Amino acid sequence: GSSGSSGLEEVQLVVEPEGGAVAPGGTVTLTCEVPAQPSPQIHWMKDGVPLPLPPSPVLILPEIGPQDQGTYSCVATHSSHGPQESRAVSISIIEP
Secondary structure, eight states: OOSSOOOOOSOOOEEESTTSEEOTTOEEEEEOOOSSOSSOOOOOEESSSBOSSOOOSEEEEESOOTTTOEEEEOEEOOSSOOOEEOOOEEEEEOOO
């Protein structure tokens, strides 16, 4: 958190659903395809730790559950750019 600072970010992480939640056993899609960059350096972190998976502009997490719950985030790193971490998406289970 923070007292109340306002900032911007080039990267626009897109999760599905947008809300960032799904039933216990669904499938989510983490799209971080930067508009300015065609094939930038896409990354995936879970709780401040690099997950064992190949870097791609599309990361689907089928069969989500309680263990899946957490907070993901895509980081873009390429020429004329720096370590920019997109908003953190907290994936949780919905109780319909």
